[PDB]
């Protein structure tokens, strides 16, 4: 239970005040919702195309607003919200040219042709989402879900309400139908109030995995489907034939974009012992040099982290690690003033036991673990609770793709830059959740697949 | 754990639950078996379905026999059940590797593709009106895509559960890539608990899949939950009349009226309503119902005498709140758990028949108005898995078939399930897919590999 | 379970009546609550008066009450009566006594600058069982009443005639709107009013899975609750017990009600030397039982209530039997429309079978042999359940020493068990928490409440 | 995870790693076989072994108070007060629990029925660390004497209390498994409540781990006590003796700096003395001396957590945005220690943060009554119900208000504290169930009739 409120993290000072959805209000959203799908289900898949489009053109219009309101209600860095900004208006056109040919019915081995498979919408889709890119977790979710014929009613982080009203108010430009789109401040009663409500037809979840756990609990319950993208610790191997300059480019971004507010940031570097040292000098020199401060300013690298209380738990996840035995190479220390400024860290000589190696370190900090050899790096990587992303960096071109295959994670890079993209499935395995987004899975997780047949006898 | 023979009421066995320790032995088993299983190459799995299949055609009348003591089932119905899963083995053999190759994607120039890996063992809880094919329609493709199967059985066809693992150990499949437990509820939320079940899949009452659904999603693992049904049978004015009478009574009658996806809700326009409910009674009163080893009928007993009772009540109080007793409504004196071949005319949409899943011999008859009160009259349910249509105009009934809430839709035929289709529904009868590639792929990590991305 | 009234003696439908719908729900809860503010301002006085009009207004339709808790579910009409002369009874007893239970205490604080004030609570929701319509409902509702609060039950789905009937009685009686009600509440509309604020706290008297259903709810809403779930209860007799007195006890405290009582004799230890003789006692006793139409007086015994649990009954007979246990008598269900099943006997019960670890809800006696007094005591306590017990000895230490040792709620020496209000009833493991009846059930649904002047 | 930081310096003390599954079986194996044991003790026995705490928590005291403040930022001098009113609870309980567990006599004719209270179990208990000694003995106490065994899961911040309570115990001879511990993490506290061997649980906390614990003991059928938070109001009307009204209003808001679940939080005020009150409140206020909770001379210390002083300010920051006035105060202290100024929010209306939420640290919010049946009606829109004070020379008016109150306790003309010879505990939100008196010991007890001869 957090407060709707919304501070800027840069400077501290109150922002606004938003009151939680009254039960008029919850019942409002809900109707809407669903007179909204009653008219949006029977609408021509490429007048959703067009809907979209038209979305990303408004996104477009208002795109420096946009990305000024992200950066103030949650401080990450003015050229990354800007970045957010044109990332999540091209997924709209990505998806209005490729999204509706993955509609298309499929046909069956049936003979004769008697058998169809058809992808009906399956209603309202309730979305939880979180604070660390307050428009492309929206959107990532909310463009396929309403291209396959569904309304999308949204709970956002209540320190992004701002955000969120925007959001809304672009959308509308746009000529989104009433219901189609919309949102609700809902407390945690109401979020429950409307899962159990049966004009919810299912649900998706970004965040942390105790609200994910809590609202899968639920929707589970309501006999709803879940997608549930959660956090990560995902591994980064280094091999002793890797590309040493690139692996370490590769690394800092990973960690460090969004001030390393990120589910698939880089968090655990598992280095072979060859070259274990020359990495960390390398990484921890390119850490330092990044500039933090005023996210307003374009070339500061690392903004203030968003909440005050996340700050205070990850100086805490720091202290016990150092507690347990971890080597700091790097930073460690809240930043004095009335922002919200954690110093970047580097905590090295982590071992499978520790703190930062067993929980999501969700801010600037990386962890560095030796590995004796490939088979140990593998093994390392796979003992977490969490399976979201990882990154393989070596020369062995073989050994990549085998290492791969076993690494218990739902995306891999190799000898590059993790990231999403609406080309490939996003999500994870074990702690990390459930489901995937984006390509063709995203679109289909909220579809009813509904077996058409003639004349069976 | 009690197995009792429906048709004479008495006792067959008594399994007592598994204890600490046979939970701990099935989930390590399997987590082992998964370990190795998982490197096994796609064509070693699906020459493992090939054998299975074949294992189970050598003990075909064995398995029918089983299905038959334990749960009541026509023995020519048991029968047919072994022939589908055996053929089942086969088709996925066949059609199933196909499923599991790599995808290309947009991203220039062959640098990513996404792979469809093994997940892990999962736990399924599966119930007892198809003992074997209920098992085998998850279990097949969760095996071919290389991940483990661990079953918590219906207690009432345990001798059927031991059966089956028999069977599938005699056909090669290793030790914990296929296992089976009898726990009890406690059991079941231990091991939905611990790390090494993956993800589990439900086929069951809504009760059950909401309990499991719950837990499951706590713990952060995905399911399937396949849970009932209150199948809607529209009849329009213009339809094959004789077909359409036929295809309702297999609908409604088949394993005496104890299927997911029976047709329970017979929808008729006026124009037909009275020349469709008389052949329909008629039909119905020419079932013949006994001792299920007797081939000529077509009836056995119900399989629990608890659910028996259960739908018994579901028929007075639909009477009492206003429906008309054509046929039946009765339960048939004698230590066997049988129940009247049943008619209700005349329900509207506030009854008990009409709201509820009638899980054995009772048809419920409601008149239309018109072609949209027919719609507006199907899609008036919390459940949601399939319907059937009869129209004899083919534009109709597409435009019918896209506004049907539910995951299935028959335009002038038989439903049933086959693995070439997708088979699951919405709203309380459950979400997630099983058969064709959709059941292959819900029990995989989909992972996406790119090389290069700078 | 279906909103369907039947009667278990013919098979035949009674009465069906829809769940209540959002708007009675509503109707329900703010009466209640109105009910209460005006409730919780009378004085003692005026409550107590209101008990005694209950008392008088149950004795004006004491025949009409029998009746239909007879129709409804099977009881013998002679315990049917027996139910509604004990709740006439416990109303005037609560009259009498009850008001000084609710006297301000003194403290040891010095100089009476502080006492301890039982103040009422609000609206207690409660949740009750079809096996005593009448006496589980007045059990509760007479001192949750008395101090002050509002009662608003939710009936078992298959006596809800009785529920009406109550209903009537009590505002014959001249209880204020609101103070006494009933709602026909699905599972959907007992969630939805334990999370209402205008629900202050919850009683359960039924089953353990629905206690524990109901037990996660109000837990989760932070409020408190009392749970009077099944019993399987041990009746100890040793070697030197009086025999005639024992078996007599035996019988009345298995097979009243058609065995269908959470504080019946279920399991019957007895040591070794005395096994065969009380076996013998028993048997032809059970066996002298007459069973029949409720209606007809001189019938012992009715059908059971439900059909799904005479069902449920006779699968663990079968599986007792599965497992080794010897059928002495009964054991079948009775053949026609009705629901009746034997008067069972099983004996060689073994701790690991059915008959000893689960509640056998009907007239079914498990009979277990004990080597002496210690083996008799643990095999006692072997049990999930801890509800109330018995012990026939003439050894007056002995059997004190052991009422110590038992994990139950209630130890009966030498007697016959009984729920009454002048002492607590109530037990430990799964069969529930919580007391009821003597000042233990009024005190229960108190906000107990320090008042200290001065503290300086 | 389990560390424990000094909040005064923001210096890691220890990390301290969950209980494994081993040690889950031990704690329980071991309070199992404990209560075995101790529910055939005497009374008599029992009582001496209280006793015996309170005599090794007096040859202790010191380390006990070093260790609170160290921890968790209490002032010294208020430390050294909780080791005194525990050890003082131990005796207490000595003297006038042993009566307690007499027989009670019945009405059933020729004393032939009683009401035995016996042991129930092993009791499960989860305890805050704003009191990490006073809030463990509270329940400890009368839970050991009824003949049950007490297994603690404490605050993940206050192990080292935790660690030293046990060595006293031990030293003072308390039997094994009859008292003890375990760092157990979520997981391993639901895994305790299913366990057979814990027969009850006691929570003292949050809300919402009342709410979440309150749920799994019930499913496991399982009686609980709920000693949960609250937002105590605190009247004062206008024929009330100012300064004395002042005086309490000051001590019941800032003791602890502020972290006390009965502190007073909430002022309402009547019309006529609201300015007075205001005035004179916030210059007391002002007044208090915050720093360093070694020195023996300061009010109030940091607060224990560094996210709790965050979300305070934030509750904080959104009154303020609301319309609440800021008389004084609220902003955080600059520096490497977890100090929050002391804070006066007035103009407070009940659609506010500072009104509607709990506010757990030195913030005092003050709304103001047109007459006392306002001042009642302001009290009692609350969802909790814990205490209440009321400053009033009109004794009969006092004593009306105090009947109509929705709370378990009510302090007239007076400073509101917890005491062994009064029950202790709220309604709504504040959870259900007593402590102290008769009604602390009694909670834990099997309440077993036994009746001979009846017919």
Same mark, same amino acid.
């Given at each position: 239970?957090?407060?709707?409120?919304?501070?800027?993290?840069?400077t501290?000072?109150?922002? &606004?005040?938003?009151?939680?959805?009254?039960?008029?209000?919850?019942?409002?959203?809900?109707? *809407?919702?669903?007179?909204?799908f009653?008219?949006?289900?029977?609408?021509?898949?490429?007048?959703?195309?067009?809907?979209?489009?038209?979305?990303?053109?408004?996104?477009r219009?208002?795109?420096?607003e946009?990305?000024?309101?992200?950066?103030?209600?949650?401080?990450?860095?003015?050229?990354?919200?800007?970045?957010?900004?044109?990332?999540?208006?091209?997924?709209?056109?990505?998806?209005?040219?490729?999204?509706? &040919?993955? #509609?298309?019915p499929?046909?069956?081995?049936?003979?004769?042709?008697?058998?169809?498979?058809?992808?009906?919408?399956?209603?309202? =889709?309730?979305?939880?989402?979180?604070?660390? /890119?307050?428009?492309?977790?929206?959107?990532?979710?909310?463009?396929?879900?309403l #291209?396959?014929?569904?309304?999308?009613?949204?709970?956002?982080?209540?320190?992004?309400?701002?955000?969120?009203?925007?959001?809304?108010?672009?959308?509308?430009?746009?000529?989104?139908?009433? !219901?189609?789109?919309?949102?609700?401040?809902?407390?945690?009663?109401?979020?429950?109030?409307?899962?159990?409500?049966?004009?919810?037809?299912?649900?998706?979840?970004?965040?942390?995995?105790?609200?994910?756990?809590?609202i899968?609990?639920?929707?589970?319950?309501?006999?709803?489907?879940?997608?549930?993208?959660?956090?990560?610790?995902?591994? /980064? =191997?280094?091999?002793?034939?890797?590309?040493?300059?690139?692996?370490?480019?590769?690394?800092?971004?990973?960690?460090?974009?969004?001030?390393?507010?990120?589910?698939?940031?880089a968090k655990? /570097? =598992?280095?072979?012992?060859?070259?274990?040292?020359?990495? $960390?000098?390398?990484?921890?020199?390119?850490?330092?040099? #990044?500039?933090?401060?005023?996210? *307003?300013?374009?070339?500061?690298?690392?903004?203030?982290?968003?909440?005050?209380?996340?700050?205070?738990?990850?100086?805490?996840?720091?202290?016990?690690?150092?507690?347990? !035995?971890?080597?700091?190479?790097? !930073?460690?220390?809240?930043?004095?003033?009335?922002?919200?400024?954690?110093?970047?860290?580097?905590?090295?000589?982590?071992?499978?036991?520790?703190?930062?190696?067993?929980?999501?370190?969700?801010?600037?900090?990386?962890? =560095? $673990?030796?590995?004796?050899?490939?088979?140990?790096?593998?093994?390392?990587?796979?003992?977490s609770?969490?399976?979201?992303?990882? $990154?393989?960096?070596?020369?062995?071109?073989? *050994?990549?793709?085998?290492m791969?295959?076993?690494?218990?994670?739902?995306?891999?890079?190799?000898?590059?830059?993790?990231?999403?993209?609406?080309?490939?499935?996003?999500?994870?395995?074990?702690?990390?959740?459930?489901?995937?987004?984006?390509?063709?899975?995203?679109?289909?997780?909220?579809?009813?697949?509904? $077996?058409?047949?003639?004349?069976?006898?």
């Amino acid at each position: 239970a957090t407060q709707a409120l919304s501070v800027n993290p840069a400077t501290g000072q109150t922002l &606004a005040a938003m009151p939680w959805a009254n039960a008029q209000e919850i019942e409002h959203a809900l109707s *809407l919702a669903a007179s909204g799908f009653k008219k949006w289900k029977m609408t021509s898949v490429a007048q959703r195309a067009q809907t979209l489009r038209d979305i990303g053109q408004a996104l477009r219009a208002h795109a420096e607003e946009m990305a000024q309101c992200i950066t103030r209600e949650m401080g990450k860095p003015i050229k990354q919200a800007r970045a957010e900004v044109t990332k999540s208006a091209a997924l709209c056109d990505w998806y209005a040219e490729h999204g509706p &040919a993955m #509609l298309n019915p499929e046909p069956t081995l049936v003979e004769n042709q008697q058998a169809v498979i058809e992808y009906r919408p399956l209603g309202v =889709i309730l979305a939880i989402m979180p604070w660390n /890119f307050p428009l492309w977790q929206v959107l990532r979710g909310a463009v396929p879900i309403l #291209l396959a014929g569904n309304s999308y009613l949204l709970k956002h982080a209540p320190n992004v309400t701002g955000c969120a009203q925007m959001i809304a108010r672009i959308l509308a430009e746009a000529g989104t139908p009433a !219901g189609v789109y919309g949102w609700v401040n809902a407390n945690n009663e109401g979020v429950s109030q409307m899962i159990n409500d049966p004009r919810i037809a299912a649900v998706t979840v970004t965040g942390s995995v105790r609200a994910g756990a809590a609202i899968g609990a639920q929707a589970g319950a309501a006999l709803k489907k879940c997608v549930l993208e959660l956090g990560g610790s995902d591994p /980064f =191997i280094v091999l002793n034939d890797a590309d040493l300059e690139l692996a370490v480019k590769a690394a800092v971004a990973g960690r460090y974009q969004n001030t390393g507010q990120v589910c698939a940031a880089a968090k655990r /570097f =598992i280095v072979e012992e060859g070259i274990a040292q020359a990495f $960390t000098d390398r990484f921890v020199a390119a850490a330092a040099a #990044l500039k933090m401060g005023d996210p *307003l300013v374009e070339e500061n690298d690392l903004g203030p982290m968003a909440r005050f209380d996340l700050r205070d738990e990850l100086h805490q996840q720091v202290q016990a690690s150092v507690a347990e !035995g971890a080597r700091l190479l790097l !930073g460690g220390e809240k930043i004095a003033g009335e922002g919200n400024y954690y110093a970047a860290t580097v905590l090295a000589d982590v071992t499978p036991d520790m703190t930062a190696f067993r929980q999501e370190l969700f801010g600037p900090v990386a962890a =560095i $673990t030796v590995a004796k050899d490939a088979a140990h790096a593998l093994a390392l990587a796979n003992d977490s609770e969490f399976g979201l992303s990882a $990154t393989i960096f070596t020369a062995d071109d073989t *050994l990549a793709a085998e290492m791969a295959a076993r690494l218990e994670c739902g995306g891999v890079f190799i000898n590059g830059y993790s990231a999403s993209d609406a080309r490939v499935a996003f999500g994870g395995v074990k702690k990390s959740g459930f489901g995937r987004e984006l390509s063709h899975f995203g679109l289909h997780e909220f579809c009813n697949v509904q $077996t058409v047949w003639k004349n069976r006898v």
